[PDB]
Amino acid sequence: VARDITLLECVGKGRYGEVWRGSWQGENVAVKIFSSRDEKSWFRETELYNTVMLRHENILGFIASDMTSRHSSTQLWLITHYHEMGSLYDYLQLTTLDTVSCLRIVLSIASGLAHLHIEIFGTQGKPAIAHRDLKSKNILVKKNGQCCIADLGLAVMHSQSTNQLDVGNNPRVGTKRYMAPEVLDETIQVDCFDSYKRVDIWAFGLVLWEVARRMVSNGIVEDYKPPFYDVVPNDPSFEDMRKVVCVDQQRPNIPNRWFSDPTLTSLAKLMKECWYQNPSARLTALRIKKTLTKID
Amino acid sequence: VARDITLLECVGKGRYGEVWRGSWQGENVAVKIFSSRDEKSWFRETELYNTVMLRHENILGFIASDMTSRHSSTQLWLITHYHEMGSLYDYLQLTTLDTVSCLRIVLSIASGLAHLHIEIFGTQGKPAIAHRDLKSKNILVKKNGQCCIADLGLAVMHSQSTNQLDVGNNPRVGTKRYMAPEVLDETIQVDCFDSYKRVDIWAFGLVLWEVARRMVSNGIVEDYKPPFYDVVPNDPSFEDMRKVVCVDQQRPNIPNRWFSDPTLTSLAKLMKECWYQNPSARLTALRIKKTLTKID
């Protein structure tokens, strides 16, 4: 089917490869073409899409995964639904948010992440899945104002039936800017599936921060900024992050104007419960989901 | 609701209190009257029945918990379904088993234990529950040849809605005869919920041993004996058990004649995989259920 996709324009590009707006069967599609060095991620994401029943409103839906030759060389493609509003990263720089829009975004993400983390038994079930590269560029905004989570190339899996933690075999590591302290300082218990969920929760708190900044209260709003924008450069090194997060113990600042708004007050408390040093102390995805469902 | 029951005969009495066949609305019921020293166990088990949807064919069904004044003293009652075949401890002493009835017993136990251990979500859900006092006296035999698990007095609970382990406040500790190595040597990670499930699997392996001895093969069967009958006395001390299980690494002996019967050969393997010194190496309850489902 890759043969029948017309590529229209590149809408994203990095070390991972490229993403194109494509045309297939009269519809827009997104086509990720992986770079020659990220093949293990293609393989992992193709694995999940072909073996795990993983359909959910807030998880990017796959159309197909192909191996195609483009002028005497094999490319690995992932074809998915196309979301014209773009990633959450771009969207937040192009608009501000009201309370309703802000809460739909962060609840839809929590709902997606809770569905990954929870094992489902029986016929149409799935193992537990930790994401491990959660960030605002890996979240797409839908026209209905909810989001969906993309990029399963680092997923780890677990099934209670087995002692079996399925970590794959991918040299890729998570985005440094969003790595939790226990990943930066290499004390993460790599044999414990729960450790990976607590890493997703750390990174979720950062996304929550990023989105809350863009909700208007009392007529004012903060500029879009990425986590730790003030203390690390662009493309921060491993050591930059370790210094800020581990040695200096820093966390994103809460703007004072948030305390004059009850929603932002509740989101401030929530995000700080994603950031405890002790990974065991952090909220679960399901607790976040429930809490955001009650926030008004 | 304790006034609506008439106690007819005491069918058991020990350190824990007493159990009575009572009469209620045309049916037998079991009435456990707790001893004064075991008040916290009544409280825990009343806490569970009041806060947890716990219904399963292989878990002793509760009718009510009540406080009542008899003899000018307060008795704490737990009123359950009654099983005239008695506990597994009684039944194994009354009779021998054929292959079908042996597998029906130990499968149904695995099935109840798996159900305790697994967390269920939604409106029909429940937290994960570890039992902590599993033994043949805490398992009742039903007329249909299946069993149900009793005695949640030491239960510990866990759910994906909170990273806090819900332990009791109960000084009571499990039956020493069945305690796992990591309990006896006090190396159990008291903060990790998984380690309490692993304690149940140790004990389940011991129950499996007791049941297996009573399955006849090629006209051979063993007398009923409790685990470790040959190396500790009745009512063994904590040291008695630690010397056998930890210091000497002893394990219940496998009768040679089991290796002449394919079923008992499969049961011997399954026991072994319950008895590893390393708790994390042990099978899960769900994998035991699945294995016993496929053993013929």
Ligand SMILES: O=c1c2cc(-c3ccnc4ccccc34)ccc2ncn1-c1ccc(N2CCOCC2)cc1
């Ligand atoms: O980039 C995408 C996109 C990417 C994936 C995708 C597929 C496979 N793997 C991924 C891993 C990480 C993140 C995304 C994917 C799936 C669907 C997608 N729909 C849309 N756009 C996208 C479309 C437009 C835009 N502009 C930029 C800012 O606003 C206006 C237009 C920016 C992004």
Ligand SMILES: O=c1c2cc(-c3ccnc4ccccc34)ccc2ncn1-c1ccc(N2CCOCC2)cc1
């Ligand atoms: O003891 C029971 C029994 C106990 C519970 C029960 C309720 C609440 N908590 C518990 C905690 C641990 C164990 C059991 C319970 C529930 C149902 C029960 N049905 C039957 N008998 C029982 C009845 C008779 C006998 N003999 C065996 C020897 O030949 C004479 C009869 C032995 C046991």
